[PDB]
Design a protein around this ligand. Structure first.
Ligand code: HEM
Ligand SMILES: CC[C@H]1OC(=O)[C@H](C)[C@@H](OC(=O)CN(C)C)[C@@H](C)C[C@@H](C)C(=O)/C=C/[C@H]1C
Length: 397
């Protein structure tokens, strides 16, 4: 169990479009499997709902790179001093710095402005005289980048760069491009950081700079970079792809769409079922076991790289009966789309606010809303960590 049993790159775009038969085939063989990912990394996948849930929570699985046998590349080593790539105590201190910002009740205060963004976006989209636009271009991309940039203080002219950068390190065309995108991003962000110093800004990045400058032990210049990185990315493509993936899932299931429209109180569950069925985090961020870990006979060496395949947990039928059915009334509680345990998503209330407002906006404002593409005209990314589409063509009357 040391060369990979499968090269996911080799399976081409059919794996990208529909990875679930691959993972379910693995599950039927066991909990853990050595694979080569499309970008060339050799890693272990963890499959099946109970094992996935347990590995997510398990402190035998570190997220700290000093526990990884694979070293960080130069560009990645700029950025790793972030909460998601730490264990306690560092994780504990870093999450405390921004916790207050992202509670349900603080994020609720952003409702008028989020609603405002969505309303103007849907307004501009609906101007198309033919009744056809791209929902990714018109809504799903522009909304989250706007909201997070205003929170942090990223000037409007600088926002376009991030789609380009973050695209390159999700679907790298080649291993180099994703490293160079990473470098430019970190450079931009260090320049952004320095530009806040002494300017008395009221934004999140401005507060963090002052915290860092007041006591470097409390937040170091490296941690400030990594924090800015984490908040911009782990939010980015995730929230953008939640909204496009969930709207694709609802528009491809006309029975469900009709039901939601008929009873808009189904909205919250509809967004939960979107996360369950086609959540953006197909596999959780890397875990490194700190000692050999035995998973039903399959031993992962200490220090190897472990992806927990959240997407496969969500299709496990013992936990989610009739799991291939998109059903906005199912009980979704216990899904893993926001993780589980001490790393559970901190942006989860913001993500929910965004996706809820966007989804309801589209339903109320686009009569006869439907996909304007044939199922196989769509293009998904190969990367097993993120589930996402390039375009989502839609139409309305
Ligand atoms: C629908 C959109 C989102 C999804 C699906 C998502 C998913 C996740 C998941 C699965 C994790 C845990 C990863 C792991 O254990 O390996 C995570 C953690 C995290 N998320 Fe999100 N997230 C989303 C939105 C956001 C937003 C909008 C923000 C920030 C403004 C954000 C910030 C973070 C951060 C900082 C962590 C690190 C938490 C920690 O280590 O304690 N996320 N997210
Ligand atoms: C779960 C939510 C996101 O996780 C992250 O932000 C991780 C921590 C990021 O990796 C690093 O920083 C790497 N480190 C060694 C510096 C992102 C950039 C990983 C990538 C697949 C992405 O663009 C999408 C990432 C999401 C899956």
């Amino acid at each position: 169990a040391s060369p990979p049993v499968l090269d996911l790159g080799a399976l081409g775009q059919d794996f990208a479009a529909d990875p679930y038969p691959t993972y379910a085939r693995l599950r039927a063989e066991g909990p853990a499997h050595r694979v080569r990912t499309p970008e060339g990394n050799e890693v272990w996948l963890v499959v099946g709902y109970d094992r996935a849930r347990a590995v997510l929570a398990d402190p035998r699985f570190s997220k700290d790179w000093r526990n990884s046998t694979t070293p960080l590349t130069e560009a990645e080593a700029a950025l790793n001093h972030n909460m998601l790539e730490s264990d306690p105590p560092r994780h504990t201190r870093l999450r405390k710095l921004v916790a207050r910002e992202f509670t349900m009740r603080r994020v609720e205060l952003l409702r008028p402005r989020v609603q405002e963004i969505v309303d103007g976006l849907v307004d501009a989209m609906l101007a198309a005289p033919d009744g056809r636009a791209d929902l990714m271009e018109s809504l799903a991309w522009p909304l989250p980048i706007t909201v997070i940039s205003e929170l942090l203080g990223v000037p409007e002219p600088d926002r376009a760069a991030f789609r380009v950068w973050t695209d390159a390190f999700v679907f790298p065309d080649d291993p180099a491009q994703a490293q160079t995108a990473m470098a430019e991003m970190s450079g931009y962000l260090s320049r952004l950081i320095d530009s806040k110093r002494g300017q008395d800004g009221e934004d999140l990045l401005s507060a963090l700079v002052r915290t860092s400058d007041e006591d470097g032990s409390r937040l170091t210049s490296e941690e400030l970079l990594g924090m800015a990185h984490i908040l911009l990315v782990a939010g980015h493509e995730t929230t953008v792809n939640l909204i496009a993936n969930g709207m694709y899932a609802l528009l491809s299931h006309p029975d469900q769409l009709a039901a939601l429209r008929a009873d808009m109180t189904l909205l919250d569950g509809a967004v939960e079922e979107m996360l369950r069925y086609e959540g953006p985090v197909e596999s959780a961020t890397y875990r490194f076991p700190v000692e050999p870990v035995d998973l039903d006979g399959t031993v992962i060496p200490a220090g190897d790289t472990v992806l927990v395949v959240l997407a496969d947990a969500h299709r496990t039928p013992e936990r989610f009966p009739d799991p291939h059915r998109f059903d906005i009334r199912r009980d979704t509680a216990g899904h893993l789309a926001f993780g589980h345990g001490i790393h559970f998503c901190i942006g989860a209330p913001l993500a929910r606010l965004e996706a809820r407002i966007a989804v309801r906006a589209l339903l109320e404002r686009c009569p006869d809303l439907a996909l304007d593409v044939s199922p196989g005209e769509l293009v998904w990314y190969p990367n097993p960590m993120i589930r996402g589409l390039k375009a989502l063509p839609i139409r309305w009357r």
